[PDB]
């Protein structure tokens, strides 16, 4: 019998999990998703994701694929999986895909949104889904300071010591910093990311926005190539994986990025 | 020695509490806030709220007052109090007020926003802070159908049986329904509300918006004076107390209502 390969759009609140990746030590998003899919499929299912997210990080645009011998209507993979999942994980859509699709290796870019709540006093609504930053932030100054990161660049100054890639070079396709009321949102897209690149970049933009560092400091850090000179890694709770690019031949759905009320 | 009367703006995620009031409940917002204030004041503190909220309901614009013999700087009533509160409750501001102020009796109106997530599939991010409604809604149709609620009206058809008020008559100051992407937001302001009035109005508005009841139905239910004819009470999860009106002489802070990214 045929082995079907299926892609899913997954959303999750990452606050009650210890990251995406399944392992034998702590609760993960992947384990809950695999248990729900196996219930529907009536066999053990293994999923492969576009981008693993660390503990506390959320997703609206995560994509996975899996193989199954189970033939089913689209309802099974959407309503059925969601009925079996906890309330903080959900399928957004299902698409059957060709055998040559791979949620990680077919992807050509990933995009993240980082949500900062900027006030002296901490927030209570979505408290583990926003990062509280105490001192006032100048979002326009952060925006202008971030534009130098566009294109192919050596991201050694924003790279964690644990990254195992052998090159620190990546291509940032866009970067935007905007204020929405008391919130400051960082939107960044690249082909791929070195370990903790997004949160490292946000951590330093935060020092520029608070006026602890100049507007040209990001250009300066980039040029100086040393992660010890850059700001501490920003907290996990404001980060969302919001979109993954794939070739148009796969025709995957593209529902709103969000999180929540933000526009595409 | 003076007795000081202090007002605070309070925000809370209601999902882990069984409503505001501590009476008859193991888990309440009021208990947590009174424990926090008693520790800062070094004496037992009792707070009085502008509008009690039911189990699961949220607040961004709640206001309380309390009396204390403790003379403290504004930081103790904000940072100090927040240090003694759980992560899902927070003080937004402090203001000393005259003796004649009462968070309930000085208020002239309360305003709520109700957030509906209107996709076929349920959400995962902010799952206990939005109401999932699976049938497609026509927000403009809901808006038009709601306007007959304006002004002084007998809200019998939208009142729960547990309401003990004399008169079911209240004054609806405004009501609007707008779509924001996949979300539908009901914004309603009245001098005061009867029990379950907001959630009962929203329940019937969603039936109209889904084309299950005619656009005239809200006016027909209003005139019928029988809550058994009206739709089921909408879920608590999407409801937020976002603002309370007080006379200008009190000069109370008016920070963003949200929740989250919604503009004022
Ligand atoms: Cl990161
Ligand atoms: Cl209500």
Short mmCIF file of C-alpha atoms and ligand atoms in Angstrom, two decimals:
data_model
loop_
_atom_site.label_atom_id
_atom_site.label_comp_id
_atom_site.label_asym_id
_atom_site.label_seq_id
_atom_site.Cartn_x
_atom_site.Cartn_y
_atom_site.Cartn_z
CA UNK A 1 0.00 0.00 0.00
CA UNK A 2 1.02 3.59 -0.56
CA UNK A 3 2.91 5.71 1.93
CA UNK A 4 1.44 9.22 1.97
CA UNK A 5 3.55 12.32 2.79
CA UNK A 6 1.51 15.11 4.45
CA UNK A 7 2.40 18.71 5.44
CA UNK A 8 0.76 20.62 8.26
CA UNK A 9 0.79 24.24 9.46
CA UNK A 10 1.25 24.22 13.24
CA UNK A 11 0.63 26.97 15.81
CA UNK A 12 1.68 26.78 19.47
CA UNK A 13 2.01 28.71 22.70
CA UNK A 14 5.51 27.49 23.73
CA UNK A 15 5.31 28.59 27.36
CA UNK A 16 4.43 25.22 28.89
CA UNK A 17 6.96 23.25 26.81
CA UNK A 18 10.73 22.87 26.83
CA UNK A 19 11.11 23.57 23.12
CA UNK A 20 9.96 21.96 19.94
CA UNK A 21 12.27 18.96 19.83
CA UNK A 22 11.29 15.65 21.33
CA UNK A 23 13.69 13.97 23.70
CA UNK A 24 13.48 11.73 26.79
CA UNK A 25 14.14 14.50 29.37
CA UNK A 26 11.41 17.09 29.11
CA UNK A 27 7.95 17.82 27.59
CA UNK A 28 8.03 19.10 24.04
CA UNK A 29 5.75 20.39 21.31
CA UNK A 30 6.87 17.60 18.92
CA UNK A 31 5.96 14.84 21.37
CA UNK A 32 2.39 16.10 21.81
CA UNK A 33 1.95 16.53 18.06
CA UNK A 34 3.27 13.01 17.38
CA UNK A 35 0.98 11.49 19.96
CA UNK A 36 -2.02 13.20 18.42
CA UNK A 37 -1.09 12.20 14.88
CA UNK A 38 -0.46 8.61 15.90
CA UNK A 39 -3.93 8.44 17.46
CA UNK A 40 -5.52 9.56 14.19
CA UNK A 41 -3.29 7.41 12.02
CA UNK A 42 -3.47 4.26 14.17
CA UNK A 43 0.30 3.85 13.88
CA UNK A 44 3.42 5.55 15.28
CA UNK A 45 3.99 8.89 13.44
CA UNK A 46 7.23 10.89 13.32
CA UNK A 47 7.21 14.57 12.29
CA UNK A 48 9.97 16.73 10.77
CA UNK A 49 9.84 20.52 11.30
CA UNK A 50 10.90 23.58 9.32
CA UNK A 51 12.68 25.23 12.27
CA UNK A 52 13.20 23.86 15.80
CA UNK A 53 12.27 26.43 18.43
CA UNK A 54 13.92 26.71 21.86
CA UNK A 55 12.16 26.53 25.24
CA UNK A 56 9.51 29.19 25.64
CA UNK A 57 9.40 30.21 21.96
CA UNK A 58 6.06 30.21 20.14
CA UNK A 59 4.96 29.49 16.62
CA UNK A 60 2.26 30.62 14.23
CA UNK A 61 3.96 29.64 10.94
CA UNK A 62 5.67 26.35 11.85
CA UNK A 63 5.37 23.66 9.16
CA UNK A 64 5.94 19.92 9.54
CA UNK A 65 5.74 16.92 7.27
CA UNK A 66 5.20 13.26 8.14
CA UNK A 67 4.68 9.95 6.34
CA UNK A 68 1.79 7.59 7.05
CA UNK A 69 0.16 4.51 5.57
CA UNK A 70 -3.16 5.93 6.77
CA UNK A 71 -5.52 7.17 4.08
CA UNK A 72 -7.84 9.84 5.50
CA UNK A 73 -9.98 12.88 4.70
CA UNK A 74 -8.60 16.33 5.50
CA UNK A 75 -10.92 16.45 8.57
CA UNK A 76 -8.85 13.78 10.31
CA UNK A 77 -5.64 15.71 10.06
CA UNK A 78 -7.21 19.01 11.18
CA UNK A 79 -10.30 18.53 13.39
CA UNK A 80 -9.15 15.04 14.42
CA UNK A 81 -5.57 15.96 15.36
CA UNK A 82 -6.80 19.13 17.14
CA UNK A 83 -9.28 17.09 19.21
CA UNK A 84 -6.33 14.95 20.39
CA UNK A 85 -3.94 17.87 21.06
CA UNK A 86 -3.67 20.03 24.20
CA UNK A 87 -5.30 23.50 23.91
CA UNK A 88 -1.95 25.30 23.43
CA UNK A 89 -1.04 23.47 20.17
CA UNK A 90 -3.15 23.46 16.96
CA UNK A 91 -3.13 22.50 13.31
CA UNK A 92 -3.92 25.45 11.00
CA UNK A 93 -4.10 23.50 7.72
CA UNK A 94 -3.22 20.24 5.97
CA UNK A 95 -1.81 19.65 2.47
CA UNK A 96 -0.74 16.30 0.93
CA UNK A 97 2.66 16.88 -0.75
CA UNK A 98 4.96 15.02 -3.12
CA UNK A 99 7.61 12.54 -1.92
CA UNK A 100 10.36 15.10 -2.62
CA UNK A 101 9.01 17.60 -0.04
CA UNK A 102 10.91 18.00 3.25
CA UNK A 103 9.70 20.53 5.82
CA UNK A 104 13.31 21.44 6.68
CA UNK A 105 15.25 20.85 3.49
CA UNK A 106 12.68 22.25 1.06
CA UNK A 107 12.45 25.53 3.03
CA UNK A 108 14.37 28.51 1.71
CA UNK A 109 13.75 31.14 4.42
CA UNK A 110 12.26 31.60 7.88
CA UNK A 111 10.68 34.70 9.43
CA UNK A 112 10.24 35.63 13.07
CA UNK A 113 8.36 38.33 14.97
CA UNK A 114 9.57 39.40 18.46
CA UNK A 115 7.01 41.14 20.68
CA UNK A 116 8.28 43.50 23.38
CA UNK A 117 5.89 45.09 25.95
CA UNK A 118 7.59 48.37 26.89
CA UNK A 119 6.56 49.89 30.22
CA UNK A 120 8.00 50.41 33.68
CA UNK A 121 5.47 47.87 35.02
CA UNK A 122 5.16 44.32 33.76
CA UNK A 123 2.14 43.10 31.79
CA UNK A 124 -0.36 40.52 32.97
CA UNK A 125 -2.16 39.74 29.66
CA UNK A 126 -0.11 37.30 27.54
CA UNK A 127 2.65 37.51 30.20
CA UNK A 128 4.58 34.52 28.81
CA UNK A 129 3.94 35.57 25.18
CA UNK A 130 5.59 39.04 25.24
CA UNK A 131 9.00 40.19 26.56
CA UNK A 132 8.84 42.94 29.18
CA UNK A 133 11.47 45.62 28.67
CA UNK A 134 11.56 48.27 31.46
CA UNK A 135 13.40 51.36 30.19
CA UNK A 136 11.78 53.33 27.34
CA UNK A 137 12.60 52.14 23.80
CA UNK A 138 12.90 54.29 20.67
CA UNK A 139 11.50 51.98 17.95
CA UNK A 140 12.42 54.24 15.02
CA UNK A 141 16.04 54.36 16.13
CA UNK A 142 16.04 50.56 16.44
CA UNK A 143 14.57 50.32 12.92
CA UNK A 144 17.12 52.61 11.32
CA UNK A 145 19.97 50.84 13.25
CA UNK A 146 18.86 47.42 12.00
CA UNK A 147 18.92 48.16 8.25
CA UNK A 148 22.68 47.53 8.02
CA UNK A 149 21.96 43.82 8.72
CA UNK A 150 20.34 43.40 5.33
CA UNK A 151 21.91 41.02 2.86
CA UNK A 152 24.76 38.53 3.10
CA UNK A 153 26.72 39.20 6.31
CA UNK A 154 29.02 37.58 8.88
CA UNK A 155 26.82 37.25 11.99
CA UNK A 156 29.67 36.25 14.32
CA UNK A 157 28.76 39.09 16.73
CA UNK A 158 25.20 37.68 17.09
CA UNK A 159 26.18 34.00 17.24
CA UNK A 160 25.96 31.81 20.35
CA UNK A 161 29.01 29.81 21.46
CA UNK A 162 26.99 26.60 21.15
CA UNK A 163 26.23 26.94 17.37
CA UNK A 164 27.81 24.07 15.38
CA UNK A 165 27.53 25.48 11.82
CA UNK A 166 30.92 25.85 10.21
CA UNK A 167 30.13 29.28 8.73
CA UNK A 168 28.59 32.33 10.46
CA UNK A 169 27.39 33.89 7.20
CA UNK A 170 23.65 34.26 6.52
CA UNK A 171 21.41 36.45 4.33
CA UNK A 172 18.84 38.70 6.07
CA UNK A 173 16.03 39.41 3.60
CA UNK A 174 14.30 41.97 5.69
CA UNK A 175 14.16 43.59 9.05
CA UNK A 176 11.65 45.98 10.47
CA UNK A 177 11.06 47.49 13.90
CA UNK A 178 7.72 49.12 14.58
CA UNK A 179 5.80 50.43 17.59
CA UNK A 180 2.15 49.47 18.19
CA UNK A 181 0.92 51.30 21.33
CA UNK A 182 3.13 50.13 24.22
CA UNK A 183 4.52 47.30 22.11
CA UNK A 184 7.68 47.26 20.01
CA UNK A 185 7.80 44.50 17.35
CA UNK A 186 10.93 43.22 15.57
CA UNK A 187 10.23 41.42 12.29
CA UNK A 188 13.19 39.55 10.75
CA UNK A 189 13.48 37.14 7.82
CA UNK A 190 16.59 35.29 6.61
CA UNK A 191 17.56 32.23 4.59
CA UNK A 192 18.73 30.54 7.81
CA UNK A 193 19.85 31.55 11.31
CA UNK A 194 22.95 30.81 13.38
CA UNK A 195 22.26 29.66 16.94
CA UNK A 196 20.35 32.35 18.82
CA UNK A 197 20.81 34.90 16.00
CA UNK A 198 17.33 36.43 16.34
CA UNK A 199 17.39 36.86 20.11
CA UNK A 200 21.04 38.07 19.94
CA UNK A 201 20.06 40.69 17.35
CA UNK A 202 17.01 41.78 19.35
CA UNK A 203 19.08 41.97 22.56
CA UNK A 204 21.47 44.42 20.94
CA UNK A 205 18.71 46.43 19.19
CA UNK A 206 17.17 46.79 22.65
CA UNK A 207 20.34 48.48 23.99
CA UNK A 208 20.30 50.81 20.99
CA UNK A 209 16.56 51.56 21.54
CA UNK A 210 17.09 52.38 25.23
CA UNK A 211 19.93 54.77 24.23
CA UNK A 212 22.51 52.71 26.09
CA UNK A 213 24.34 52.40 22.68
CA UNK A 214 24.40 54.56 19.53
CA UNK A 215 22.31 54.13 16.40
CA UNK A 216 25.46 53.02 14.52
CA UNK A 217 26.32 50.33 17.15
CA UNK A 218 24.82 47.46 15.11
CA UNK A 219 27.05 48.39 12.12
CA UNK A 220 29.88 48.65 14.60
CA UNK A 221 29.23 45.19 16.13
CA UNK A 222 28.84 43.63 12.73
CA UNK A 223 32.19 45.09 11.66
CA UNK A 224 33.95 44.21 14.91
CA UNK A 225 33.00 40.47 14.79
CA UNK A 226 33.01 39.52 18.48
CA UNK A 227 29.96 38.19 20.35
CA UNK A 228 31.41 39.19 23.76
CA UNK A 229 30.97 42.85 22.73
CA UNK A 230 27.25 42.39 22.03
CA UNK A 231 24.25 42.56 24.38
CA UNK A 232 22.89 39.57 26.31
CA UNK A 233 20.47 37.30 24.44
CA UNK A 234 16.90 38.63 24.59
CA UNK A 235 14.32 36.54 26.47
CA UNK A 236 12.58 33.67 24.78
CA UNK A 237 8.98 34.54 25.60
CA UNK A 238 8.48 37.30 23.03
CA UNK A 239 9.70 35.23 20.03
CA UNK A 240 7.35 33.77 17.40
CA UNK A 241 8.23 31.71 14.27
CA UNK A 242 5.66 33.27 11.87
CA UNK A 243 6.41 32.11 8.28
CA UNK A 244 8.49 29.62 6.31
CA UNK A 245 9.11 30.00 2.56
CA UNK A 246 8.86 27.03 0.19
CA UNK A 247 8.86 26.79 -3.60
CA UNK A 248 5.58 27.78 -5.16
CA UNK A 249 5.20 24.33 -6.82
CA UNK A 250 4.20 22.95 -3.41
CA UNK A 251 1.27 25.43 -3.20
CA UNK A 252 1.21 25.54 0.59
CA UNK A 253 -1.38 27.68 2.37
CA UNK A 254 -0.29 31.10 3.69
CA UNK A 255 -2.72 32.14 6.48
CA UNK A 256 -2.10 35.25 8.59
CA UNK A 257 1.26 35.51 10.35
CA UNK A 258 0.20 37.40 13.43
CA UNK A 259 0.61 36.72 16.32
CA UNK A 260 -2.96 37.68 17.06
CA UNK A 261 -4.08 41.11 15.82
CA UNK A 262 -1.01 42.18 13.87
CA UNK A 263 -1.42 42.53 10.12
CA UNK A 264 0.55 40.64 7.51
CA UNK B 1 -2.26 59.94 61.66
CA UNK B 2 -4.00 60.03 58.31
CA UNK B 3 -5.80 57.27 56.52
CA UNK B 4 -4.94 57.43 52.85
CA UNK B 5 -7.31 56.35 50.05
CA UNK B 6 -5.52 55.02 47.00
CA UNK B 7 -6.73 53.92 43.58
CA UNK B 8 -4.95 51.43 41.35
CA UNK B 9 -5.40 50.34 37.73
CA UNK B 10 -5.26 46.51 37.65
CA UNK B 11 -4.69 44.14 34.69
CA UNK B 12 -5.15 40.37 34.81
CA UNK B 13 -5.32 37.22 32.72
CA UNK B 14 -8.49 35.64 34.22
CA UNK B 15 -7.91 32.09 32.95
CA UNK B 16 -6.47 30.59 36.14
CA UNK B 17 -8.93 32.30 38.51
CA UNK B 18 -12.55 31.73 39.32
CA UNK B 19 -13.36 35.42 38.88
CA UNK B 20 -12.57 38.67 40.69
CA UNK B 21 -14.46 38.24 43.97
CA UNK B 22 -12.90 36.23 46.78
CA UNK B 23 -16.32 35.42 48.33
CA UNK B 24 -17.14 31.73 47.95
CA UNK B 25 -14.12 30.96 45.73
CA UNK B 26 -10.78 29.21 46.36
CA UNK B 27 -8.95 31.04 43.58
CA UNK B 28 -9.75 34.73 42.93
CA UNK B 29 -8.06 37.82 41.64
CA UNK B 30 -9.14 39.84 44.69
CA UNK B 31 -7.46 37.41 47.12
CA UNK B 32 -4.12 37.68 45.32
CA UNK B 33 -4.22 41.50 45.18
CA UNK B 34 -5.28 41.86 48.82
CA UNK B 35 -2.43 39.52 49.86
CA UNK B 36 0.02 41.61 47.85
CA UNK B 37 -1.18 44.95 49.20
CA UNK B 38 -1.28 43.64 52.79
CA UNK B 39 2.39 42.69 52.55
CA UNK B 40 3.35 46.19 51.23
CA UNK B 41 1.12 47.99 53.75
CA UNK B 42 2.09 45.76 56.74
CA UNK B 43 -1.59 45.56 57.66
CA UNK B 44 -4.73 43.82 56.33
CA UNK B 45 -6.00 45.56 53.16
CA UNK B 46 -9.43 45.29 51.53
CA UNK B 47 -9.96 46.42 47.97
CA UNK B 48 -13.15 47.59 46.23
CA UNK B 49 -13.42 47.10 42.43
CA UNK B 50 -15.14 49.08 39.71
CA UNK B 51 -16.70 45.99 38.13
CA UNK B 52 -16.65 42.40 39.34
CA UNK B 53 -15.68 39.98 36.55
CA UNK B 54 -16.83 36.35 36.30
CA UNK B 55 -14.69 33.24 36.12
CA UNK B 56 -12.33 33.23 33.12
CA UNK B 57 -12.93 36.91 32.27
CA UNK B 58 -9.96 39.26 31.84
CA UNK B 59 -9.21 42.85 32.75
CA UNK B 60 -7.03 45.60 31.34
CA UNK B 61 -9.01 48.59 32.72
CA UNK B 62 -10.12 47.38 36.14
CA UNK B 63 -9.80 49.97 38.90
CA UNK B 64 -9.79 49.44 42.65
CA UNK B 65 -9.57 51.65 45.69
CA UNK B 66 -8.39 50.78 49.21
CA UNK B 67 -7.66 52.65 52.45
CA UNK B 68 -4.39 52.30 54.35
CA UNK B 69 -2.53 53.89 57.24
CA UNK B 70 0.72 53.22 55.32
CA UNK B 71 2.50 56.20 53.80
CA UNK B 72 4.52 54.78 50.89
CA UNK B 73 6.08 56.16 47.71
CA UNK B 74 4.37 55.35 44.40
CA UNK B 75 7.00 52.66 43.65
CA UNK B 76 5.88 50.53 46.64
CA UNK B 77 2.29 50.50 45.36
CA UNK B 78 3.40 49.48 41.87
CA UNK B 79 6.78 47.68 41.71
CA UNK B 80 6.43 46.53 45.35
CA UNK B 81 2.91 45.21 44.84
CA UNK B 82 3.86 43.56 41.52
CA UNK B 83 6.73 41.79 43.26
CA UNK B 84 4.16 40.15 45.58
CA UNK B 85 1.73 39.17 42.80
CA UNK B 86 1.65 36.20 40.41
CA UNK B 87 2.68 36.77 36.81
CA UNK B 88 -0.88 36.90 35.52
CA UNK B 89 -1.99 39.89 37.66
CA UNK B 90 -0.35 43.32 37.64
CA UNK B 91 -0.72 46.91 38.80
CA UNK B 92 -0.64 49.39 35.88
CA UNK B 93 -0.69 52.64 37.93
CA UNK B 94 -1.31 54.24 41.34
CA UNK B 95 -3.13 57.51 42.20
CA UNK B 96 -3.97 58.91 45.66
CA UNK B 97 -7.62 60.03 45.63
CA UNK B 98 -10.01 62.13 47.74
CA UNK B 99 -12.03 60.60 50.56
CA UNK B 100 -15.17 60.87 48.49
CA UNK B 101 -13.90 58.43 45.81
CA UNK B 102 -15.24 54.87 45.47
CA UNK B 103 -14.05 52.63 42.64
CA UNK B 104 -17.63 51.36 42.16
CA UNK B 105 -19.86 54.27 43.17
CA UNK B 106 -17.82 57.08 41.60
CA UNK B 107 -17.73 55.28 38.20
CA UNK B 108 -20.26 56.34 35.60
CA UNK B 109 -19.71 53.64 32.95
CA UNK B 110 -17.84 50.39 32.18
CA UNK B 111 -16.55 49.31 28.76
CA UNK B 112 -15.74 45.79 27.54
CA UNK B 113 -14.13 44.34 24.42
CA UNK B 114 -15.01 40.74 23.45
CA UNK B 115 -12.53 38.98 21.14
CA UNK B 116 -13.78 36.30 18.78
CA UNK B 117 -11.36 34.14 16.74
CA UNK B 118 -13.38 33.21 13.64
CA UNK B 119 -11.56 30.46 11.76
CA UNK B 120 -12.93 26.95 11.24
CA UNK B 121 -10.01 25.53 13.33
CA UNK B 122 -9.29 26.48 16.93
CA UNK B 123 -6.37 28.70 17.90
CA UNK B 124 -3.42 27.78 20.12
CA UNK B 125 -1.87 31.20 20.93
CA UNK B 126 -3.89 33.02 23.60
CA UNK B 127 -6.25 30.01 23.66
CA UNK B 128 -7.89 31.09 26.94
CA UNK B 129 -8.01 34.77 25.91
CA UNK B 130 -10.09 34.58 22.72
CA UNK B 131 -13.42 32.84 22.02
CA UNK B 132 -13.32 30.41 19.12
CA UNK B 133 -16.51 30.61 17.01
CA UNK B 134 -16.32 28.18 14.06
CA UNK B 135 -19.19 29.37 11.79
CA UNK B 136 -18.25 32.35 9.53
CA UNK B 137 -19.41 35.72 10.83
CA UNK B 138 -20.56 38.88 9.02
CA UNK B 139 -19.20 41.59 11.32
CA UNK B 140 -21.02 44.46 9.52
CA UNK B 141 -24.34 42.64 9.89
CA UNK B 142 -23.62 42.18 13.58
CA UNK B 143 -22.81 45.89 13.91
CA UNK B 144 -26.04 47.00 12.25
CA UNK B 145 -28.17 44.56 14.29
CA UNK B 146 -26.63 45.78 17.56
CA UNK B 147 -27.53 49.45 17.28
CA UNK B 148 -31.09 48.96 18.57
CA UNK B 149 -29.46 48.33 21.99
CA UNK B 150 -28.35 51.97 22.37
CA UNK B 151 -29.71 54.11 25.18
CA UNK B 152 -32.04 53.25 28.02
CA UNK B 153 -33.49 49.80 27.44
CA UNK B 154 -34.98 46.88 29.33
CA UNK B 155 -32.36 44.15 29.04
CA UNK B 156 -34.57 41.32 30.36
CA UNK B 157 -33.90 39.11 27.31
CA UNK B 158 -30.14 39.43 27.92
CA UNK B 159 -30.19 38.99 31.70
CA UNK B 160 -29.18 35.80 33.53
CA UNK B 161 -31.66 34.33 36.04
CA UNK B 162 -29.23 34.92 38.94
CA UNK B 163 -29.43 38.72 38.54
CA UNK B 164 -31.01 40.32 41.58
CA UNK B 165 -31.07 43.90 40.38
CA UNK B 166 -34.28 45.85 40.79
CA UNK B 167 -34.90 46.91 37.14
CA UNK B 168 -33.40 45.27 34.14
CA UNK B 169 -33.09 48.82 32.66
CA UNK B 170 -29.57 50.02 31.81
CA UNK B 171 -28.14 52.61 29.40
CA UNK B 172 -25.95 51.35 26.52
CA UNK B 173 -23.65 54.23 25.62
CA UNK B 174 -22.10 52.63 22.56
CA UNK B 175 -21.82 49.24 20.82
CA UNK B 176 -19.69 48.38 17.81
CA UNK B 177 -18.67 45.21 15.97
CA UNK B 178 -15.54 45.26 13.74
CA UNK B 179 -13.42 42.60 12.01
CA UNK B 180 -9.61 42.54 12.37
CA UNK B 181 -8.31 39.79 10.05
CA UNK B 182 -9.74 36.51 11.39
CA UNK B 183 -10.87 38.21 14.60
CA UNK B 184 -14.23 39.84 15.30
CA UNK B 185 -14.34 42.38 18.16
CA UNK B 186 -17.48 43.56 20.01
CA UNK B 187 -16.90 46.83 21.95
CA UNK B 188 -19.73 47.81 24.32
CA UNK B 189 -20.03 50.55 26.98
CA UNK B 190 -22.95 51.03 29.44
CA UNK B 191 -23.54 52.84 32.73
CA UNK B 192 -23.66 49.36 34.31
CA UNK B 193 -24.47 45.80 33.27
CA UNK B 194 -26.98 43.17 34.44
CA UNK B 195 -25.65 39.65 35.07
CA UNK B 196 -24.14 38.09 31.92
CA UNK B 197 -25.43 41.03 29.87
CA UNK B 198 -22.30 41.34 27.67
CA UNK B 199 -21.87 37.62 26.99
CA UNK B 200 -25.63 37.24 26.40
CA UNK B 201 -25.65 40.13 23.88
CA UNK B 202 -22.58 38.68 22.15
CA UNK B 203 -24.13 35.19 22.01
CA UNK B 204 -27.17 36.50 20.14
CA UNK B 205 -25.06 38.77 17.93
CA UNK B 206 -22.96 35.79 16.80
CA UNK B 207 -26.14 33.91 15.70
CA UNK B 208 -27.11 36.96 13.62
CA UNK B 209 -23.55 37.24 12.24
CA UNK B 210 -23.56 33.55 11.23
CA UNK B 211 -26.83 34.05 9.30
CA UNK B 212 -28.66 31.67 11.66
CA UNK B 213 -31.03 34.49 12.80
CA UNK B 214 -32.25 37.55 10.93
CA UNK B 215 -30.70 41.00 11.31
CA UNK B 216 -33.85 42.11 13.11
CA UNK B 217 -33.44 39.47 15.81
CA UNK B 218 -31.70 41.60 18.44
CA UNK B 219 -34.60 44.10 18.35
CA UNK B 220 -37.12 41.25 18.42
CA UNK B 221 -35.45 39.69 21.49
CA UNK B 222 -35.17 43.11 23.17
CA UNK B 223 -38.91 43.62 22.76
CA UNK B 224 -39.82 40.05 23.84
CA UNK B 225 -38.69 40.25 27.46
CA UNK B 226 -37.83 36.55 27.73
CA UNK B 227 -34.18 35.41 28.03
CA UNK B 228 -35.23 31.82 27.09
CA UNK B 229 -35.72 32.97 23.47
CA UNK B 230 -32.15 34.28 23.17
CA UNK B 231 -28.95 32.49 22.24
CA UNK B 232 -26.73 30.65 24.72
CA UNK B 233 -24.38 32.83 26.77
CA UNK B 234 -21.09 33.38 24.90
CA UNK B 235 -17.93 31.91 26.43
CA UNK B 236 -16.01 33.85 29.10
CA UNK B 237 -12.57 33.43 27.45
CA UNK B 238 -12.83 36.34 25.02
CA UNK B 239 -14.20 38.99 27.44
CA UNK B 240 -12.12 41.91 28.69
CA UNK B 241 -13.02 44.79 31.06
CA UNK B 242 -11.11 47.56 29.21
CA UNK B 243 -12.15 50.89 30.74
CA UNK B 244 -14.12 52.55 33.51
CA UNK B 245 -15.27 56.19 33.33
CA UNK B 246 -14.82 58.56 36.28
CA UNK B 247 -15.34 62.31 36.72
CA UNK B 248 -12.46 64.37 35.38
CA UNK B 249 -11.75 65.91 38.78
CA UNK B 250 -10.21 62.60 39.91
CA UNK B 251 -7.53 62.88 37.18
CA UNK B 252 -6.96 59.12 36.94
CA UNK B 253 -4.53 57.65 34.37
CA UNK B 254 -5.94 56.39 31.05
CA UNK B 255 -3.35 54.00 29.61
CA UNK B 256 -4.02 51.91 26.51
CA UNK B 257 -7.07 49.72 26.74
CA UNK B 258 -6.12 46.87 24.41
CA UNK B 259 -6.08 43.95 24.99
CA UNK B 260 -2.68 43.76 23.31
CA UNK B 261 -2.31 45.38 19.88
CA UNK B 262 -5.81 46.80 19.52
CA UNK B 263 -5.72 50.56 19.15
CA UNK B 264 -7.69 52.78 21.48
CL1 LIG C 1 16.85 33.22 18.53
CL1 LIG C 2 -21.04 39.21 30.65
#
